[PDB]
């Protein structure tokens, strides 16, 4: 159980995520110590909101550290889908937090009343965005995007509460506007994660499939091709399965090798081709 | 765009889900009309909570109606994973609503003050639990479970607020207890959905795989078996891929037929077997 911490410290991304989680927890302790007093009306709410943020960060870190685990009998493909699941859960969490921020803005507009804790949170999340930057093999592409979207959403929420404080020297309007903005921002990541989880044909492979089918159909001995299935595994590993109907005397070796080469030139890493010998 | 409503009315499950969504929206209208007054402190919060419930119900209905769509070029396997995604999102939504209910209980305990609207919601959700009961092909197994878990969680929340009302003639304790209870209740569905989305070996197939491998290894001409991959598609369709190394003169037809029969007897519906002829 102790070796998990050292394994986390091995990778730089896990180290940055752990440092971020630790500093968020320290901020949680500071804000709850400040809120022990009677002015905790919105302090409890924003404390629970940043608890949700810490939970999302912990989930992302757990998925990132899990994704490097070796495969076994239970998980033939390994744990490379953990990053996709982390991206999906981060998108859903961002949507739900946008709706929660809209609800909190509505509550603040309805009920008149926190002014300096938001500044500290803005400092924390600007430090976070300063730390985080991006610009089978290599199964780490979505954790950075998810954490970046979450931290930018937190920064925009801090900007919105700062604007509300400036206004009081309407907050629901800016709150709902920023919620819609972050929802639109997270739409592409959510749709990409859904497409990955849908067993959908990879977007970068859809155009090349007709050309590959035409090329393999022209192979000598191949009669018919049927039951194609292509999907992404983690980020780029496209696991494609094919069924071929060849001549009763067709050379299976050459056809299999040519099909494998054709689909490897298209970017399909793992490929499974079944060659069926037609009856007359 | 109009034909979607008739398509929903075609299936009984979609009809029940649509009726439930319509009655939840009617309850939303009634409660907001009641809350237009100055006693909307907790009314806005529970209105947003049941808006979240309506959103989850709409997502479940959309996934259920999508899952019956035919496959195409973009989605080779179709939309049968929509039910698994709906189950996963319902589990995450239930967890987040449990945490939200805990937060609301904390707020109610901290801030002293809604007594009859909860009774109406209890009537609505008991009618819902009365309506809902359960006890490639057939791609509908998780929507009913997800909606049943959500409606039972709503009933338990109504029971908790009723208990709090009885107490006032501690509510945070019962709120957190019921939140933990519903989280534990939703753990099995969440873990099953994660296992489906993890490309994990199906739980009902794990035990039979060693026996199938031993049986296929005993086939004449088969030298080595490598790179096994089995996973569930929607609920029972197990898409398995296999690679075989056979003798240079082994009969590919008989080996392929025997492997297909062996894996079909184990419950693998769609199977892809690649036969490789070893060099000497």
């Amino acid at each position, epitope marked *: 159980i102790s070796g998990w911490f050292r394994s986390i410290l091995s990778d730089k991304t896990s180290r940055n995520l752990f440092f971020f989680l630790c500093l968020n927890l320290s901020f949680a302790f500071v804000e709850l110590l400040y809120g022990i007093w009677s002015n905790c009306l919105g302090l409890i709410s924003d404390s629970f909101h940043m608890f949700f943020d810490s939970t999302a960060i912990l989930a992302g870190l757990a998925a990132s550290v899990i994704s490097k685990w070796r495969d076994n009998d239970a998980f033939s493909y390994g744990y490379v889908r953990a990053e996709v699941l982390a991206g999906f859960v981060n998108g859903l969490f961002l949507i739900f937090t946008a709706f929660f921020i809209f609800s909190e803005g509505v509550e603040r507009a309805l009920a008149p009343p926190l002014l300096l804790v938001s500044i500290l949170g803005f400092v924390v999340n600007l430090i976070g965005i300063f730390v985080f930057k991006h610009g089978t093999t290599g199964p780490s592409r979505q954790i950075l995007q998810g954490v970046f979207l979450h931290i930018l959403a937190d920064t925009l929420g801090s900007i919105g509460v700062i604007a509300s404080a400036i206004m009081m020297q309407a907050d629901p309007i800016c709150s709902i506007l920023i919620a819609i903005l972050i929802v639109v921002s997270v739409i592409p990541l959510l749709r990409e994660s859904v497409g990955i989880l849908m067993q959908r044909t990879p977007p970068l492979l859809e155009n090349s499939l007709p050309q590959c089918y035409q090329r393999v159909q*022209q192979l*000598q001995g191949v009669y018919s091709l049927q039951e194609q299935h292509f999907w992404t595994l983690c980020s780029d590993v496209y696991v494609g399965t094919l069924k071929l109907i060849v*001549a*009763p*005397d067709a050379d*299976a*070796r*050459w056809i299999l*090798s*040519q099909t494998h080469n054709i689909f490897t030139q298209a970017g399909v890493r793992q490929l499974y081709v079944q060659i069926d010998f037609a009856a007359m | 765009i109009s034909g979607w409503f008739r398509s929903i009315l075609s299936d009984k499950t979609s009809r029940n889900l649509f009726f439930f969504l319509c009655l939840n929206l009617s309850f939303a209208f009634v409660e907001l009309l009641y809350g237009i007054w100055s006693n909307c402190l907790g009314l806005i919060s529970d209105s947003f909570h049941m808006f979240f419930d309506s959103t989850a119900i709409l997502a479940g209905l959309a996934a259920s109606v999508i899952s019956k769509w035919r496959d195409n070029d973009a989605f080779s396997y179709g939309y049968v994973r929509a039910e698994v995604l709906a189950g996963f999102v319902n589990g995450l939504f239930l967890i987040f609503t449990a945490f939200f209910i805990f937060s609301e209980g904390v707020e109610r305990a901290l801030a002293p003050p809604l007594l009859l609207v909860s009774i109406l919601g209890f009537v609505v959700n008991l009618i819902g639990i009365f309506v809902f009961k359960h006890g490639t092909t057939g791609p509908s197994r998780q929507i009913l479970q997800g909606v049943f878990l959500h409606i039972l969680a709503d009933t338990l929340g109504s029971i908790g607020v009723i208990a709090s009302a009885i107490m006032m003639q501690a509510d945070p304790i019962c709120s957190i207890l019921i939140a933990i209870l519903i989280v534990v209740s939703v753990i099995p569905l969440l873990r099953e959905s994660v296992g489906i989305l993890m490309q994990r070996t199906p739980p009902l197939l794990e035990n039979s795989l060693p026996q199938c491998y031993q049986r296929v290894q005993q086939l004449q001409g088969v030298y080595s078996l490598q790179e096994q991959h089995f996973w569930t598609l929607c609920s029972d369709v197990y898409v398995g891929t296999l690679k075989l190394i056979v003798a240079p003169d082994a009969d590919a037809r008989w080996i392929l037929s025997q492997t297909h029969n062996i894996f079909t007897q184990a419950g693998v519906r769609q199977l892809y077997v690649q036969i490789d002829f070893a060099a000497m």
Partner: antibody
Amino acid sequence: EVQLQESGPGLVAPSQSLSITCTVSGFSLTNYAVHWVRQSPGKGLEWLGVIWSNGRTDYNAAFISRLSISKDNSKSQVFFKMNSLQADDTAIYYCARKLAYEGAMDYWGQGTSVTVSS
Amino acid sequence: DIVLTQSPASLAVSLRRRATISCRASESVDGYGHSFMHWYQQKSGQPPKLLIYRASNLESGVPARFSGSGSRTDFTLTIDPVEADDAATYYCQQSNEDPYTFGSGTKLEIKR
């Protein structure tokens, strides 16, 4: 006792059509492929085309425009037709049975000397 | 097209000696560890006869004296021992890439 015999005209006028019928025996065309290879003193051996079990055929890139290979499984005969012959098309035309599940040809037949001249 | 070059063009080998014919391909013809190069023997006034398929497997019904190795681009057909009946023209043929191409023939002359 597998045999392949061709029956084609020895002399063909230039810019005419060549018809060669390769009658097979000892095996059925329903499960085997027959290749067509011509040999000339110049350019050496050259591959023309092949016809598969039910009728699918693949032609050489050079001759794809002016080639046509037919087959009739009932009479166990393979029809070979070329259009617009020239001087360099004079060669020895062989019909060869494709090896069992291999890219080579195992059994051949004594080709017919096709000479293109006026 | 894949051009196949056979060296030497003409070879003179004494009886009961060892004969080596090498076929070189412009491009690699290996597919997943399988070499798709085949050897043919054509005597005087006879159709070519298949000897070795896939560059390492003897066709059924040929004498065991014929041996063949090679991989990728360079291949080699070995006759040991060489008999008087082995005086013919040998062709190397590849089936890796459409169209099939036959290399220039190599004439084997028996020294006596």
